[PDB]
Each structure stands twice: as C-alpha cells, then as structure tokens.
C-alpha cells in the first residue's frame, strides 16, 4: 500500500498544500480556478484575519497547519506560502 491513513489523507493535504502553494504563488485574483481563488483567499482569509489562530477560525489554523507543516518540508524562504517562508525564517 502507499499510504493508508491517507494516501487519501496526505494526498488530500498535499493538494491542500499544492493548492495552497499555488494559491500563494499564484497571484491572479481572477485566476479562474475559483477554487484556486479560494485557497488563495484562504491564505488571504487567513492573513486578513487575525482571529485565524487567535480566535479560532481554523481555516488559517488548518492552513497554518497546512502551510507550516508544509513549510516544515518545502525548504524555501522566498516566494509563495504563509507560514512557509515566515515559519521558514532561520
């Protein structure tokens, strides 16, 4: 088997991240992948929000999760993602 908690869990976050990453990196608010919009807007929901984590709006949280636990593995300091190149400040 590949991943059994989730090839579907992983691949689904992998996509979450890839979307997220894309959404981070993609700066076209009218990319129309509105689902790209969305993720992007999710990054962007997240960051225009501060209740993201502080309150408990976990889009951002599961996005920080998403992004950071992503970050944790994308060694990059420069282009797309929320806590990605901000968690990635070493």
């Amino acid at each position: 088997a590949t991943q059994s908690p989730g090839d579907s869990r992983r691949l689904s976050i992998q996509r979450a991240i890839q979307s997220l990453v894309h959404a981070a990196q993609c700066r076209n608010a009218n990319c129309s992948l509105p689902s790209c919009q969305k993720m992007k807007r999710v990054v962007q929901h997240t960051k225009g929000c501060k209740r993201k984590t502080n309150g408990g709006c976990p889009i951002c949280k599961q996005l920080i999760a998403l992004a950071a636990y992503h970050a944790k593995h994308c060694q990059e300091n420069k282009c797309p993602v929320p806590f990605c190149l901000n968690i990635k400040q070493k």
């Binding site: 992983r10 992998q14 979450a16 890839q18 979307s19 993720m39 949280k61 599961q62 944790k72 994308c74």
Partner: peptide, 25 residues
C-alpha cells in the same frame, strides 16, 4: 519544490482541501 509530504506533518487537512476543491460548479 517539496510540496507533498506525509500527513504526519500536517494536522487535520479537513479545511483547506475544501478550499482547494469543493464543488461550486
């Protein structure tokens, strides 16, 4: 770039996945 990785890293994916692709038509 390493965008993909095991779900051991990441906590509950549940949200952003919907944001990645829910079905909005």
């Amino acid at each position: 770039l390493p965008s993909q990785a095991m779900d051991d890293l990441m906590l509950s994916p549940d949200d952003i996945e919907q944001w990645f692709t829910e079905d909005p038509g």
